Structure 1
Amino acid sequence: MHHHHHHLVPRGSVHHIKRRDIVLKWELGEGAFGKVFLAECHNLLPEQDKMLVAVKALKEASESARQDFQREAELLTMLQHQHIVRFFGVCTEGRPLLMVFEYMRHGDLNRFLRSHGPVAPGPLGLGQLLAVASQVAAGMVYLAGLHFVHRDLATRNCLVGQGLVVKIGDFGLPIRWMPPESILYRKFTTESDVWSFGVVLWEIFTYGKQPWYQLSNTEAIDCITQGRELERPRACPPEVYAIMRGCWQREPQQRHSIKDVHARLQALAQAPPVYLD
């Protein structure tokens, strides 16, 4: 499960939160082992009595999943960046086991894009789409620097918070986002993450449409293995499509580096290009 992160050896122990300091409110979602709740957390930060957090409750007992829980918590404790979901610690007193994250009020980025298509409501402008893209790229520059391979970068795995701050997480194969070497050989690297970033850029510029939406799962696997490229979105300026194409080079060693992709997006976000579909 976390075997691919073995080279990452944690420095310190995970933060422990007392069960009575977590007050569950309501479910935010489920899927992967298992439910996610909005909660209030007491005594976490010294200046604030209580604050909102998202709490993931582990389903299994198990005791193989308990070892996977401790390993995951030690790895998440290492991830400290403005654009990576903030992990606050665990609650291991009794059952279920809990993981606690900073709450991101606007929820997942895929749903956010779909709801703000063609917080201030309405369609997101070019400047805003570039700001979202730049933030996800910043998080990916941080992960590459740590030699952390994400393996499932997609807008459904990003969160939106107050002031449109975007952070990367992993909420639980994502074939449509994968390059040919990941589909065929299960090779997951910094370079397959940059390819998925190019697909995330395509999702952002299509307001959250599924990649290869015109194709079945089988047809999409075949089209990616054959080397067909995703079409340029209508809302995408030429400068941004060039970034996507750089991420999608068939040869992994020819793909643009995430540092350069992020620097290009920063430049465009601080501009933006004069483009109208």
Structure 2
Amino acid sequence: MHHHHHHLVPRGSVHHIKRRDIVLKWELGEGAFGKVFLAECHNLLPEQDKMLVAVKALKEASESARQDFQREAELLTMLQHQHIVRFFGVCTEGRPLLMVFEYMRHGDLNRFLRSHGPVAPGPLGLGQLLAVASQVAAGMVYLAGLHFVHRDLATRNCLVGQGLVVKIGDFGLPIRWMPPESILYRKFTTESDVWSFGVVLWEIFTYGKQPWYQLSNTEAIDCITQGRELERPRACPPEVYAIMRGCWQREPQQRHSIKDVHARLQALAQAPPVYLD
């Protein structure tokens, strides 16, 4: 499960939260092994007696998944950045085992883009789309610096919090977001993550449309492996499409670096370019 992260070694133990300090409210979702709940957490942060958090409950007993649980928690406690999901700790007293994360009030970024298409309710403007893209790219610069390969960067795996703050997580193959070498050879690197970031840019600029939406799963695999490129979205300025093309170079060593992609998006976000569809 975490074999590709073997080079990442924790400095310290995970934060432990007493079960009685967690008060479950309602389900936010499920999926990947499995249930996510909104909850109140007591005695976590000094500033607030009680605070909202998101709690993931482990389904398995197992005891293989217990080893995976501990390793996952150890890796998540290392990820400390403004644009990476914030992990608060575990609860190991009793069953099921719990993982506690920061509550991000606006939910996943894919749903957010779809519900704010053509909080402040309404369509997201160019400056806002660039700000979302810049934040994801900032998170990816941090991951590249840690030599951490995400492997499933997609808007469904990002969260939106207070003031449109965006953070990268992984809520649980995402073939449509993968480069040819990942599909064909399961080669996952900083370079395959940058290709997926180019696909995330495409999702942002299409307001959360599915990549290769016109194709079946089989047609998409073949088209990616044969070298076809996603079309420039209507809301996408030329400056932004050039970034996508840089992320999508067939040769991984030719792809633009995430530091340059982030710096370019910062430059555009702090402007933005005078672009009208």
Q: Which TM-score applies when normalising by structure 1?
A: 1.00
Aligned-partner Cα distance in 2 for 1:154–1:34: 19
C-alpha distance in structure 2 between counterparts of 1:121 and 1:268, whole Å? 24
Partner of 1:7: 7
Distance 2:223 2:128 in 1: 31
Query: What displacement does 1:202 show?
Result: 0.1
1:249 is displaced (CA, Å) by 0.1
Structure 2 counterparts to residues 147-166 of structure 1, below 5 A: 147-166=147-166
Per-residue CA distance 1:87-141 (angstroms, 9 max, x = gap): 0000000000000000000000000000000100111000000000000000000
- Output the CA distance in 1 between the equivalents of 2:148 and 2:37: 27
Q: Distance in 1 between matches of 2:87 and 2:193?
A: 22
SS at match of 2:77: helix
CA distance in 2, matches of 1:189, 1:75: 18
Distance 1:182 1:106 in 2: 31
Aligned to 1:242: 242
Matched position secondary structure for 1:24: strand
CA distance in 2, matches of 1:62, 1:102: 26
For 1:164 and 1:186, the matched residues in 2 are separated by: 34
Shift of the alpha carbon at 1:250? Answer: 0.1
Structure 1 residue 65 corresponds to structure 2 residue 28:
no
- How far is 1:156 from its partner? 0.1
Pairwise CA distance, 1:47: 1.6
Q: What is the alpha-carbon distance in structure 1 between the residues aligned to residue 194 and residue 46 of structure 2?
A: 38
What does 1:204-243 align with in structure 2 at a 5 Å threshold?
A: 204-243=204-243
Cα displacement string for residues 15-67 of structure 1 (whole angstroms, at most 9, x for unaligned residues): 00000000000000000011000000000001210100000000000000000
Runs of 4+ aligned residues of structure 1 deviating over 4 Å after TM superposition are none
Q: Secondary structure at the match of 1:137?
A: helix
Task: Give the TM-score, by structure 2 length.
Answer: 1.00
| Aligned positions of 1:5-84 closer than 5 A | 5-84=5-84
What's the offset of the Cα at 1:10?
0.7
State the alpha-carbon separation in 2 of the partners of residues 48 and 222 from structure 1.
52
CA deviation map 1:198-253 (0-9, x unaligned): 00000000000000000000000000000000000000000000000000000000
Counterpart-to-counterpart distance in 1, 2:48 and 2:78 = 24
CA positional deviation for 1:163: 0.1
| Separation (CA, whole Å) in 2 of partners of 1:34 and 1:228 | 35
What per-residue deviation string (whole Å, max 9, x for no partner) do you get for residues 132-190 of structure 1?
Answer: 00000000000000000000000000000000000000000000000000000000000
Aligned residue for 1:78, secondary structure, equals coil
Count of residue pairs brought into register by the alignment: 277
Cα RMSD (Å): 0.3
Measured in 2, the distance between the counterparts of 1:183 and 1:141 equals 23
- Partners of 1:104 and 1:275 in 2: CA distance: 31
Note the residue ranges of structure 1 that are not aligned, 5 or more in a row: none
**Distance in 1, Cα, partners of 2:261 & 2:179:** 17
SS in 1 for 2:160: strand
> Within 1, Cα distance between the matches of 2:88 and 2:206?
33
